[PDB]
Ligand binder design. Sequence first.
Ligand SMILES: *[C@@H]1O[C@H](CO)[C@@H](O[C@@H]2O[C@H](CO)[C@@H](O)[C@H](O)[C@H]2NC(C)=O)[C@H](O)[C@H]1NC(C)=O
Ligand SMILES: *[C@@H]1O[C@H](CO)[C@@H](O[C@@H]2O[C@H](CO)[C@@H](O)[C@H](O)[C@H]2NC(C)=O)[C@H](O)[C@H]1NC(C)=O
Ligand SMILES: *[C@@H]1O[C@H](CO)[C@@H](O[C@@H]2O[C@H](CO)[C@@H](O)[C@H](O)[C@H]2NC(C)=O)[C@H](O)[C@H]1NC(C)=O
Ligand SMILES: *[C@@H]1O[C@H](CO)[C@@H](O[C@@H]2O[C@H](CO)[C@@H](O)[C@H](O)[C@H]2NC(C)=O)[C@H](O)[C@H]1NC(C)=O
Ligand SMILES: *[C@@H]1O[C@H](CO)[C@@H](O[C@@H]2O[C@H](CO)[C@@H](O)[C@H](O)[C@H]2NC(C)=O)[C@H](O)[C@H]1NC(C)=O
Ligand SMILES: *[C@@H]1O[C@H](CO)[C@@H](O)[C@H](O)[C@H]1NC(C)=O
Lengths: 657, 666
Amino acid sequence: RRAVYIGALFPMSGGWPGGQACQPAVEMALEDVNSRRDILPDYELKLIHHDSKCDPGQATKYLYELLYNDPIKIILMPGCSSVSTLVAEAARMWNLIVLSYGSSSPALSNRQRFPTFFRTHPSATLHNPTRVKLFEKWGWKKIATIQQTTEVFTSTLDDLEERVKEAGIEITFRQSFFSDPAVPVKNLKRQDARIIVGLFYETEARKVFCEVYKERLFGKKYVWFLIGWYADNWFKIYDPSINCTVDEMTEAVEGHITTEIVMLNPANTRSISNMTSQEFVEKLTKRLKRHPEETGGFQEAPLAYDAIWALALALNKTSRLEDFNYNNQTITDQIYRAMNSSSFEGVSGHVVFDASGSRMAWTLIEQLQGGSYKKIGYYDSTKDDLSWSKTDKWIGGSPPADQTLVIKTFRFLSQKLFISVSVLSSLGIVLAVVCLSFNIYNPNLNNLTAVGCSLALAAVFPLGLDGYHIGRNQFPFVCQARLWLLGLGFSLGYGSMFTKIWWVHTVFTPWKLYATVGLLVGMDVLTLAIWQIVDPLHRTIETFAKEEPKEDIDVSILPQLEHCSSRKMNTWLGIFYGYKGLLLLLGIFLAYETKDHRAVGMAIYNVAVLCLITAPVTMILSSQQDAAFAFASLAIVFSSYITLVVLFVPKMRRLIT
Amino acid sequence: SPPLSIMGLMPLTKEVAKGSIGRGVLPAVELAIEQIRNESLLRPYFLDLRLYDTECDNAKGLKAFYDAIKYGPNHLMVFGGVCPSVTSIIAESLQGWNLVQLSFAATTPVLADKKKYPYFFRTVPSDNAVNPAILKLLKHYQWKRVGTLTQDVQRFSEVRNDLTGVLYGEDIEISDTESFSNDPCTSVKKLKGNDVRIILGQFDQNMAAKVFCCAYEENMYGSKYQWIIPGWYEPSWWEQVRCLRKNLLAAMEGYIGVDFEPLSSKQIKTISGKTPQQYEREYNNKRSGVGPSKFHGYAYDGIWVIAKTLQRAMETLHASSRHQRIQDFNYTDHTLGRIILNAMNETNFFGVTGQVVFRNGERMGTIKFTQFQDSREVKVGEYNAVADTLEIINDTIRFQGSEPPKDKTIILEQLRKISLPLYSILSALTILGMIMASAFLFFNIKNRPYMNNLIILGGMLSYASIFLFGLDGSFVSEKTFETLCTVRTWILTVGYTTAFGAMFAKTWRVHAIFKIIKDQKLLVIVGGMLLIDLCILICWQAVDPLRRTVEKYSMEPDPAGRDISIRPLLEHCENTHMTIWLGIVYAYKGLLMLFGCFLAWETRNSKYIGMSVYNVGIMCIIGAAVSFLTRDQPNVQFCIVALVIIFCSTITLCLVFVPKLITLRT
Ligand SMILES: *[C@@H]1O[C@H](CO)[C@@H](O[C@@H]2O[C@H](CO)[C@@H](O)[C@H](O)[C@H]2NC(C)=O)[C@H](O)[C@H]1NC(C)=O
Ligand SMILES: *[C@@H]1O[C@H](CO)[C@@H](O[C@@H]2O[C@H](CO)[C@@H](O)[C@H](O)[C@H]2NC(C)=O)[C@H](O)[C@H]1NC(C)=O
Ligand SMILES: *[C@@H]1O[C@H](CO)[C@@H](O[C@@H]2O[C@H](CO)[C@@H](O)[C@H](O)[C@H]2NC(C)=O)[C@H](O)[C@H]1NC(C)=O
Ligand SMILES: *[C@@H]1O[C@H](CO)[C@@H](O[C@@H]2O[C@H](CO)[C@@H](O)[C@H](O)[C@H]2NC(C)=O)[C@H](O)[C@H]1NC(C)=O
Ligand SMILES: *[C@@H]1O[C@H](CO)[C@@H](O[C@@H]2O[C@H](CO)[C@@H](O)[C@H](O)[C@H]2NC(C)=O)[C@H](O)[C@H]1NC(C)=O
Ligand SMILES: *[C@@H]1O[C@H](CO)[C@@H](O)[C@H](O)[C@H]1NC(C)=O
């Protein structure tokens, strides 16, 4: 026959020991293809291989060892990523073609720098549409990222940024480190982010999880996104470089979401080898003496399998191939043209690779749920199908989010204190109307004072509460109406009270005086109209309290209140209070001056001190819960009650006394 | 004689400008090797050098390396490498045979690690060797605030990362850390928004003309800013590449250049025996065709370094046995490479660049400060990190200012002064009311009964209070007089209450009659409110200390363009919690004055005393109103209160006596 030799490479250890599994796989594959005489009627396949541990110093030594020796090899098989880039960079000087099987660099899609390079493994960018859909499911916006400083991670982070920027989700905290996890996990604790995505290998995943247990940054509001092709025992192997114990790490890594992609047919079909995926997996578990949960590279071995089968059919398509030398190019271009149109059906489904790559359809997503991994669902990017199963447990059921806020409206005391206020106003109204009807049914200025105090006891009720009736947001209209009515009522009552003592002081030292005091009362409605013309009303909002008083929920409570105001109302109300205080002190001086008159003076002495003691306590107060409205209503209803029960004591008691 | 072979890996072609560099550095090393043939430092052996063209393509360089390995003899060292990728790859791969590569132009700090590169050494000073130099220059001229600007290339971001690594421990602030990629103009916008004084630029050549033209557009120059830029571009680079050179040249002066110095200024004998002047003269008369290189110094020193290194490691105890071990090296041995590493690493001697040392794969070099003086650069200062001394060339630096600018926004503060020509006429009006008071007191004793004497006492105390009101405020020659403002305010209040008690008790007794024991009761009723105001005085003493407070009014203007800002301050005697106290005091005064103010409306039919008490109660309330509506300007309030005080305090006496002596002197 003819022994055709093929160089190979298997990283037995280091950051990714897949060659431990791929080497019996390719041995099985070489024995199965050494069967049909229809594909190779003349040749025989031979295998030359070594180890490199993803170390370029050994990789350069072994490349020299295979290149500058005997016999002549044709196709090479590089293991790691940086070494794969190095060999695909330098394969051109021998006119060779290189085939990788584990690299994920999207910059490796260039044909200018890499004309003679292919890779069966799909790139890393098919975690991003699934990532943005799982972010779109819950609407989270503040995500932090941390990476080891590598090109194969920065080209992913750049693809994720330029994919998430169209979705309107910002990436706030973007950190990086090389081998020191202490200062960046200090920065993450100091920046207290909620959802954290990480991109680093395993030995530092253990170190960063020791650091995040030590900083106490795991817990309730923390979601950890990692890749998921690690083994299931990874937080269990003894590493003496760190003093952390096994179960505080196990409790720390509990409840995090892991993503991956499929590698083979989920169904059962038949290849040209007349076997299926499941029987193939059974044969791998038969011959491999270790466990698949503890070995490396167990999921990716069928891509090596159909990679050999693809090159074998390509060599049958080429069908005098025994005089190859590195100087010429005709054999290389002929084999390259025959391999370019490679398109068929293998164990992993349709096997096409002379395109832009990424021909997989479905991906996969799991969550550690109590000491073991468990499936969430499936996905396809083109059909956008997100197959679910509803098994995601959470912290009590809900997914923790970034941060919210509650606007809380400052509550009144629409309770028995308000109902007592309303019943005292109603009692004043009823008592006033009963005494006025008794006076009419047996002092016309006294009748007008009774009407004014009845209007005060009718304007006592509509001071309102914190939004409790049919129909609201007309609070300025109803408060300005109540204020105008109370103003006119107090103006009328105090004017008809004061004009009697003015005329008794005049007589001490028919409708003239009464009509002029009625126009003196109606001056105040001109003041009310001038207050109504330029700035009648406003419903303002005060934010008197501090945000987040709540104890357990991360929704900041902002208490906001409201009081009726105007554009510039403070000097206006001060001027009106000064005018009414001027009239009230004039009355209180005239009552001592011209000393009906004794009772009228004592009533003036009570009502003046009441109004003067409660003008400031409703002017300078703002806590209306038990102080402002309580003091004002107590003042006004005690005033009207006591003034009526003194001014009509001597009438009806002495009519029948 | 058996040759000891060594291999150099240099670009020798004409298809690349670094071939000129290699052709320029070849005469120095052939002169050095001919000097080694002249001295003959090695009796049994002789040295051989094999040159190899690389062009610093990775595949061609590794292929020529592989060809040399497969076909050449038992080489001993390897030499060279200029292009950074093929140096990085060879320095990573070198340990497979345990050999040593010596370069002289790798000027990237990523070869600083020895766990990555244990067999690599270089003599060129890296880019991190300017960071002690700039700290020493800043402490030489006391700069504080700086803004950085780094171009997003791996080298500039690496030196930006090392700024923080070198900066730790001193009184330094880094305010504006802008790091653009291709729009420096919005970065100068942000820098002018943070208005930082000194630029520490990090960018390439083509960005610089655009940055200075649209920094002219922002006017980021003048006698206010400095620019520290790495100046290793070619000379007059700006002659070729939206902005004219006329609108570039009047803003491209004063830009500080930070380079590495090639040679020294010592005429001392080296281990070669010559001076740098004789070496440069012999070099330039050795060669004539090539454009002059600037690396041949390092090529010449490093050849003697490795020659002294191999003779000091050649001295072994094994006379025979090592001589066979060198002559039979099948590339596998590492102990010989370990002794060669030890003997090379401890190299310390004096050459053309100076006393060369080695701190972890680095030689401590010479840093050349320079300044673009008058359309060209001039050498202005040196710095040597082995001795940490920063030399400067006096009588050469210039400044568009006169002092190297101050960096922070520096402020100054002063009290608010009052108009002295306003105060002086009030100090002249001080005496006349007091003398008229003390003269009408003698008119009252000529009448000689206590009432107008109490009026005169209140008037004298008011005329003393209005004098010592503003005399303590602006003139701060008596500094601890803000404790005594309360000690004079009690005097003023006693005079006030005395005058208003003499106004009030008389009119109250006129109302009560409208007996001499009744006048005694009136006098003790005045004494009662006198002692009430004394209790209010001790309550004011107890309620607050009324100590010296200062209101710092901050607007920071500049009257004459200097950046030394101005902020005024006002003395305030209150303690800001006596607002209830002063409110109740003003209500006390208002309640004591409204009695007479109301009663003057009644008893009009003590004939002009009510018109007096009204025409002073209006002026007193307008004084309180203008008092509370001021202290925005402490001059107009003080002069208006002096005006109303010299109005009232003599208008009481004038309207109480202007018909009195006129009818008594008919
Ligand atoms: C890892 O653990 C070892 C042993 O527990 C630590 O070394 C110290 O060992 C002595 C042995 O007598 C103990 O008394 C000390 O308490 C140990 N120190 C500590 C901090 O536990 C070693 O320090 C640990 N590693 C780290 C990083 O702390
Ligand atoms: C796989 O191999 C089997 C036999 O080596 C192929 O043929 C089977 O042939 C028998 C003959 O009577 C039939 O009864 C079976 O139904 C056949 N198996 C089938 C159709 O699966 C078989 O065709 C080969 N290929 C596949 C895809 O199974
Ligand atoms: C693989 O090699 C076979 C050689 O036997 C190629 O051709 C066969 O040709 C005979 C004669 O016409 C047919 O009866 C067979 O069916 C062919 N084999 C196959 C597998 O179809 C065959 O063309 C080669 N296949 C490729 C893809 O190159
Ligand atoms: C190998 O595959 C086919 C077959 O030779 C060719 O594909 C061409 O690819 C370019 C790149 O977009 C297209 O513009 C052409 O239309 C394709 N031609 C076809 C499909 O006939 C090409 O020779 C090779 N390269 C690629 C990238 O397919
Ligand atoms: C190069 O210089 C010396 C040469 O031995 C080494 O640093 C010395 O290391 C020894 C052993 O650790 C110490 O005893 C010496 O004190 C060190 N210094 C000196 C000046 O000898 C080391 O191989 C290299 N050191 C550096 C800084 O590059
Ligand atoms: C050095 O500087 C000082 C201070 O300006 C000056 O007095 C002196 O003349 C300078 N020396 C020379 C040589 O110019």
